[PDB]
Scaffold this active site. Structure first.
Site, mmCIF file in Angstrom:
data_model
loop_
_atom_site.group_PDB
_atom_site.id
_atom_site.type_symbol
_atom_site.label_atom_id
_atom_site.label_comp_id
_atom_site.label_asym_id
_atom_site.label_seq_id
_atom_site.Cartn_x
_atom_site.Cartn_y
_atom_site.Cartn_z
ATOM 1 N N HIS A 62 39.203 14.137 35.551
ATOM 2 C CA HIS A 62 40.581 13.674 35.464
ATOM 3 C C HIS A 62 40.757 12.295 36.087
ATOM 4 O O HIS A 62 39.948 11.859 36.901
ATOM 5 C CB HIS A 62 41.512 14.663 36.162
ATOM 6 C CG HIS A 62 41.327 14.717 37.645
ATOM 7 N ND1 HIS A 62 40.562 15.683 38.267
ATOM 8 C CD2 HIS A 62 41.805 13.924 38.634
ATOM 9 C CE1 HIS A 62 40.578 15.483 39.571
ATOM 10 N NE2 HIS A 62 41.326 14.422 39.822
ATOM 11 N N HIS A 141 40.527 5.498 38.370
ATOM 12 C CA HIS A 141 39.133 5.913 38.357
ATOM 13 C C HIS A 141 38.980 7.381 38.001
ATOM 14 O O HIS A 141 39.912 8.174 38.152
ATOM 15 C CB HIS A 141 38.519 5.691 39.737
ATOM 16 C CG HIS A 141 39.029 6.642 40.774
ATOM 17 N ND1 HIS A 141 40.168 6.400 41.511
ATOM 18 C CD2 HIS A 141 38.567 7.847 41.180
ATOM 19 C CE1 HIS A 141 40.381 7.412 42.334
ATOM 20 N NE2 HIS A 141 39.424 8.303 42.153
HETATM 21 N N1 LIG Z 1 45.323 10.986 49.345
HETATM 22 C C1 LIG Z 1 44.977 10.984 47.948
HETATM 23 N N2 LIG Z 1 45.285 9.941 47.131
HETATM 24 C C2 LIG Z 1 44.941 9.956 45.784
HETATM 25 N N3 LIG Z 1 44.275 11.051 45.268
HETATM 26 C C3 LIG Z 1 43.985 12.059 46.096
HETATM 27 C C4 LIG Z 1 44.323 12.050 47.424
HETATM 28 N N4 LIG Z 1 43.893 13.240 48.062
HETATM 29 C C5 LIG Z 1 43.269 14.020 47.101
HETATM 30 N N5 LIG Z 1 43.314 13.313 45.883
HETATM 31 C C6 LIG Z 1 42.788 13.735 44.599
HETATM 32 O O1 LIG Z 1 43.272 14.992 44.258
HETATM 33 C C7 LIG Z 1 42.221 15.895 44.150
HETATM 34 C C8 LIG Z 1 42.497 17.156 44.901
HETATM 35 O O2 LIG Z 1 42.686 16.865 46.238
HETATM 36 C C9 LIG Z 1 41.022 15.201 44.641
HETATM 37 O O3 LIG Z 1 39.943 15.620 43.865
HETATM 38 C C10 LIG Z 1 41.315 13.761 44.419
HETATM 39 O O4 LIG Z 1 41.233 13.463 43.086
HETATM 40 P P1 LIG Z 1 40.556 12.243 42.410
HETATM 41 O O5 LIG Z 1 41.627 11.365 41.778
HETATM 42 O O6 LIG Z 1 39.624 12.734 41.357
HETATM 43 S S1 LIG Z 1 39.552 11.176 43.733
#
Ligand SMILES: Nc1ncnc2c1ncn2[C@@H]1O[C@H](CO)[C@@H](O)[C@H]1OP(=O)(O)S
Ligand SMILES: Nc1ncnc2c1ncn2[C@@H]1O[C@H](CO)[C@@H](O)[C@H]1OP(=O)(O)S
Length: 210
Positions: A62, A141
């Protein structure tokens, strides 16, 4: 009523597997590349990066727009209430993957958002320092893997930091060629593959509830 854990674009199964496999292939090629072997100090003070990045998203990949934590995150309520968010909720999009990157911490794919998709990118008070001088949405990303003691969040920072290193760069910096693009060594365990042909993935904009 509350908000999602986070808003984002979730790739179809077909495109998740396609991008996920692109990631591995990059991990396998990088880990076997001579330039990488020479800088191994930043990963081990040979190495199979596929193992190194053992913490991967288990199911579908995602692209996160706004982490809300059900409203506990700053700017969360301000983001969800936007019209464009409501209007886009459930709609399909095509994300453009322009590069794959790795660091000692994370591995992932850079997403280059269309204007429409940029409207879905949050605009918070709190900004990572690495977003300095970089256009909005640059942090966009897809996370492919993380090191054992690293949080996925770090992937977005790792991308931004990389974009700082190439800010004002040219393709004459390329260490060499990989089969699908030019390889860059930005020092300190940072490596980026810039894809000759950008990848395209179908995804749906919605809300995830952990
Ligand atoms: N503080 C944050 N800021 C942006 N994305 C976040 C943050 N914390 C967690 N995530 C994202 O939400 C998912 C479940 O926690 C994680 O896998 C992170 O997702 P990604 O966008 O894939 S790095
Ligand atoms: N072959 C090397 N091994 C360890 N450090 C190196 C090597 N070559 C350059 N350095 C650098 O010397 C400093 C102390 O380690 C650091 O600045 C190392 O550089 P990096 O952090 O890797 S950019």
């Amino acid at each position: 009523d509350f908000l999602p854990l986070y808003f984002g674009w979730f790739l179809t199964k077909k495109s998740s597997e396609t991008l996920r496999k692109a990631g591995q292939v990059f991990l396998e090629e990088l880990g076997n590349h001579k330039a990488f072997k020479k800088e191994l100090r930043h990963f081990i003070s040979k190495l199979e990066l596929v193992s190194y990045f053992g913490k991967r998203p288990p199911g579908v990949l995602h692209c996160t727009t706004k982490f809300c934590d059900y409203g506990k995150a700053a700017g969360a309520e301000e983001y969800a209430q936007q019209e464009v968010v409501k209007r886009s909720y459930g709609k399909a999009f095509k994300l453009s993957i322009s590069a794959l990157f790795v660091t000692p911490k994370t591995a992932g794919a850079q997403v280059v958002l269309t204007d429409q998709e940029l409207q879905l990118w949050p605009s918070d008070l709190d900004k990572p320092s690495a977003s300095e001088g970089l256009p909005p949405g640059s942090r966009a990303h897809v996370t492919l893997g993380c090191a054992a003691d690293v949080q996925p969040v770090q992937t977005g920072l790792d991308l931004l930091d990389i974009l700082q290193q190439v800010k004002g760069g040219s393709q004459g910096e390329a260490v060499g060629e990989l089969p699908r693009g030019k390889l860059y060594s930005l020092g300190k365990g940072r490596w980026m593959l810039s894809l000759t042909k950008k990848m395209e993935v179908k995804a749906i904009f919605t809300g995830y509830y952990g």
